[PDB]
Design a protein around this ligand. Structure first.
Ligand SMILES: [Cl-]
Lengths: 273, 292
């Protein structure tokens, strides 16, 4: 009523239960989370929740978080994540800022946000074990090391392929296994790309988002993705428009105005970098 | 030298009963220069929980004087201590009374305090240990005004042995704001000392984690940390003495627990008040050393 008991899921799947005041902004919670994580470079990160459509909407860090989860969320549970994916993961200097980046990049592979082939998913899990588990005292059946995809006997074949590239990476520091793990996902397609459903100027449904180069429009019907030179970005009614002048349409006026913020946000983040 | 061998000497002193002998020979207060005339004033009697637990005049926290408090008095001691060059900055005070909540927040502001370490519940056994000087979440009174300061309670996360509360403090005259982290230990029993040593160690770790978080933003000294208990002496001294010795263990350094405690009592009387509290420091240091 006058306070919200919210649960923030860290990237390592741990939970922190925050009793939140009505006036408390989302930035204050993100700064509180950075304190517990020993995290210093809090600029690359933010928080997000499942909205009424189960769509990952990042919170408004400058607006109070208590009202956002009441009005636009299923349950009062936000998730910690990376809102600003850097082109160069070498840019990240502080140690703990890199580990949280490593957790987010690993979660993007294991859950399928960044699609990887069979072989890429194999080589990735090798560097993960040397950092998640370490240089073995001797263990892989324990936790999940592969994306969604499986056949029982292909699982046995790949797990031994990881269990042999496990010894080749021996004696190296886990912080360096995390770096080499990132700077391979760093270079993949779909890396750090967030898609939002929308319709085209012909009514054909598509997926729109802001990539590092610029606004990317990929088409569900298979049409070649265009990557927009942009004079500015604007939003009108249920539409969202760029100027050079093109416009897309979304579900409702809430969804489109939301996208304008992140695009100009990512546009501001990239022009500083 | 070894962490496991430093542990044995502490365990041996505990087992052989030496910690009981060395505690009793430490003096409770200053032999000379122990005058607390400012605290012992009639006008200031209303400002002390216990009339026998007072700060020394040369180390008392010294509020900017006003007309209601002509002496700018608050029952709080400055605790600055050095071992082999490592310096330590503390402010130890009693739990605020109702009439000293304004004086408490005046000190938190004037001394630039950003972290408060509360080692006690508001009430224990029906006796008041500290008045509720910060607003409560969940109610409609989420904001209080003491003097020229308007404190708001902004979030609260609860760990089993401790509770972290984030406060925003606003100077109504200047408009300045300051985030203040309120760390409250809640596992200390009403009678005796805590049994969960590992949980009390976590409370001291959270203090350092908040200390590191707040210092990364302040480029130009770092403010002292405010420990307070009922009288700001016994459980207050346990936190201060423990955190000092743990650093001496961290940066390998000879440990002389009675020498440090005797130095602490030269700045605030009765720091570490009971024998139980003293042996608790020995047990906490031992448990910390058995980290792995
Ligand atoms: Cl006390």
């Amino acid at each position: 009523k006058s306070c919200l008991v919210a649960r923030i899921q860290l990237l390592n799947n741990e939970f922190v239960e925050f009793t939140l005041s009505v006036e408390s902004t989302g930035q204050e919670s993100l700064e509180a989370v950075a304190q517990r994580l020993e995290l210093r470079e809090v600029t690359y990160f933010s928080l997000w929740y499942y909205n009424k459509q189960n769509q990952r909407r990042w919170v408004d860090l400058e607006k109070p978080l208590k009202k956002q989860l009441d009005k636009y969320a299923l349950e009062p549970t936000v998730y910690f994540g990376v809102v600003f994916y850097v082109p160069s993961v070498s840019q990240l200097q502080q140690e703990i800022t890199r580990y949280q980046y490593y957790l987010q990049l690993k979660k993007d592979i294991l859950e399928g946000s960044i699609p990887c082939t069979l072989e890429q998913a194999i080589q990735l899990a090798g560097l993960a074990v040397q950092a998640d588990f370490g240089d073995f005292d001797q263990f892989l059946q324990k936790f999940a090391l592969f994306p969604v995809g499986q056949d029982e006997k292909v699982l046995e074949e790949a797990t031994q392929k990881v269990a042999l590239l496990h010894q080749k990476y021996r004696g190296l520091t886990a912080p360096d296994a995390e770096m080499l793990y990132m700077q391979e996902v760093e270079r993949m397609d779909g890396y750090g790309e967030e898609s939002y459903p929308a319709k085209d100027s012909q009514g054909s449904d598509i997926s729109i988002g802001a990539c590092l180069e610029g606004i990317f429009v990929k088409h569900k019907n298979g049409r070649h993705p265009v990557v927009f030179d942009i004079a500015n970005m604007s939003h009108n009614k249920s539409f969202f428009a760029l100027e050079l002048t093109i416009q897309f349409q979304t579900e409702d006026m809430e969804t489109a105005k939301y996208i304008w913020r992140l695009c100009v946000a990512r546009h501001k983040f990239y022009r500083l970098n | 030298a070894t962490n496991d061998e430093r542990c044995k000497i502490l365990e041996q002193r505990l087992e052989q009963g030496m910690v009981f002998t060395e505690y009793e020979r430490i003096l409770k207060k200053r032999l000379v220069d122990g005058e607390c005339s400012t605290a012992r004033l009639p006008e200031n009697a209303e400002r002390n929980r216990f009339q026998d637990v007072l700060p020394y005049d040369d180390v008392r926290v010294e509020l900017v004087p006003t007309k209601e408090n002509n002496t700018g008095y608050i029952n709080a001691s400055h605790i600055k201590v050095s071992v082999s060059g490592i310096e330590w900055d503390y402010i130890a005070t009693q739990g605020p009374l109702q009439n000293t909540c304004q004086d408490f927040w005046q000190m938190v502001w004037e001394q630039g305090i950003a972290i408060i370490a509360m080692v006690t519940a508001e009430e224990e056994g029906g006796r008041e240990k500290s008045f509720r000087y910060w607003p409560r979440l969940g109610s409609r009174h989420n904001t209080v005004t003491y003097g020229r300061f308007k404190i708001t309670t902004r979030f609260r996360t609860d760990s089993g042995c401790y509770a972290t509360t984030g406060l925003k403090m606003k100077h109504l005259l200047t408009g300045q704001e300051r985030t203040v982290w309120h760390l409250q230990y809640t596992d200390w029993p009403e009678h005796g000392c805590p049994e969960d040593l590992k949980g009390f160690l976590s409370y001291l770790e959270e203090i350092q984690s908040v200390r590191r978080h707040t210092n990364s933003t302040s480029d130009p000294p770092n403010p002292p940390l405010l420990v307070h208990s009922s009288a700001g002496v016994g459980r207050t001294g346990v936190v201060i003495l423990s955190e000092i010795m743990i650093a001496c263990l961290e940066h390998n350094e000879v440990l002389d627990i009675p020498r440090v405690l005797d130095m602490l009592r030269q700045q605030r009387m009765m720091l570490v008040q009971t024998l139980c509290q003293y042996t608790f420091v020995y047990r906490v240091l031992i448990q910390f050393l058995k980290s792995s």
